[PDB]
Amino acid sequence: GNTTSSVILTNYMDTQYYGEIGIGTPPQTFKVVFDTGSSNVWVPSSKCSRLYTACVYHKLFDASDSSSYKHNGTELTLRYSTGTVSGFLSQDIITVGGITVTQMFGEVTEMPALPFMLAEFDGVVGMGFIEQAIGRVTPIFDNIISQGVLKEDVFSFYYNRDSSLGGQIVLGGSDPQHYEGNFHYINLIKTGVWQIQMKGVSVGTLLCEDGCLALVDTGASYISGSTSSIEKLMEALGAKKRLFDYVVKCNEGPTLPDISFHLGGKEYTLTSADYVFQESYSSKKLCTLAIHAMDIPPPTGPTWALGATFIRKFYTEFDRRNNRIGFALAR
Ligand SMILES: COCCCNc1nc(C(C)(C)C)ncc1C(=O)N(CC(C)C)[C@@H]1CNC[C@H](C(=O)N2CCOCC2)C1
């Protein structure tokens, strides 16, 4: 087909990027993260007990208000790094960027207050492959592709730094307004995962010396590595570990070295301004780093993950026809 389509994103505090989709007839609207690190669509459900406080604070999908709903009921549990959601399968028409698609998705009935009370978004639209879909449920982008409307079998992510357009996902191509220079492509190394070979992580190559893996994860806020790798990285930066993050004396933030990720021959460099939440310059304040430990079990990991920290600097094209990821300088 001839169409490309776009989804406008909201940037909450540089940590959460999400857009709007519609589900059902008439459309019920949900804030959703578009997540290349997972493959299932889910939203919180009206059948979620309100003893889950996360279900009191998010928009709930009521299948009883949709005339296009089709029951399935297969129970599924989706295990993420920071928490788990559980529910049952449903089918309805989903509207994303003005493209309409019949889509199987999860109605979440069990949604833990931590971490999900911290989510601005209601749910997740997985942009991954059918291979990592729980229940082998056909992902939304595979269903969009089956319509033959998209110009290209690709989608692209722009995450703005400004917290104005928060971001943009192009379905069926890319947007030249939000990148510059050439794309550099790295082909995927594992079946059904948006994952690439990484050849080194430099700090001012201290880590990933004999190669490692990098997941390009649009649904993650930060750059992550294994607890071991990050502990080494953070010793090199002089950062202190806390419960859920690494921090430095805010005055030390602008003195911190460049972090470089060796991907497909090129070096992808983040400066301190790219990975330090510089909320103060005080020696008596602590400043959080957009880099945390996240141990990912096999078969996906151990692996680094490149989240919004990375994507903010590098406009990312996800190419399904040629199984590759393209990076260009974001503008
Ligand atoms: C750019 O917008 C950022 C949105 C904020 N994202 C998160 N917010 C929270 C808060 C709720 C705290 C806000 N918690 C966690 C995340 C999070 O990073 N993810 C999950 C949620 C989208 C539900 C990863 C998504 N991609 C698969 C990641 C995985 O689980 N794995 C990597 C691939 O292999 C399997 C494991 C998890």
Which atom of ligand 1 lies nearest, measured to the CA of 217?
26
| Other Cβ atoms closer than 10 A to 5 | 18
Residue to substitute in 30, 34, 35 for testing ligand 1 pocket (most ligand atoms within 8 angstroms of CB):
35
Q: Would you say the CB of residue 229 lies under 6 angstroms from ligand 1?
A: no
Sort 153 into a burial class: Cβ within 10 Å, 0-12 / 13-18 / 19+: middle
| Other Cβ atoms closer than 10 A to 274 | 16
User: What was the elucidation method?
Assistant: X-ray
Give how far the C-alpha of residue 160 lies from the chain's centroid of Cα atoms, to the nearest Å: 14
Pairing of strands 324-330, 240-241: unpaired
Query: Strand ranges (DSSP E) for 80-138?
Result: 84-96, 99-110, 123-126
Whose tokens are 């978004």? That residue is 121
Cα angle 258, 260, 261; round to 5: 160
| Domains (range + CATH), the chain | 4-174 (2.40.70.10), 175-330 (2.40.70.10)
Q: Would you say the CB of residue 221 lies under 6 angstroms from ligand 1?
A: yes
Q: How far is the CA of 307 from the centre of ligand 1 (A)?
A: 9
Where helices occur in the chain by DSSP H, the ranges are 53-57, 113-116, 140-146, 227-237, 272-275, 308-313
35 is catalytic: yes
Task: Please compute Rg for the chain using Cα positions.
Answer: 20
- The answer to whether the beta carbons of residues 3 and 88 sit under 8 Å apart is no
54, two tokens? 């996360």
Q: Would you say the CB of residue 80 lies under 6 angstroms from ligand 1?
A: yes
Cα angle 82, 320, 309; round to 5: 40
CA distance 310 to 317: 13
CA distance 241 to 270: 21
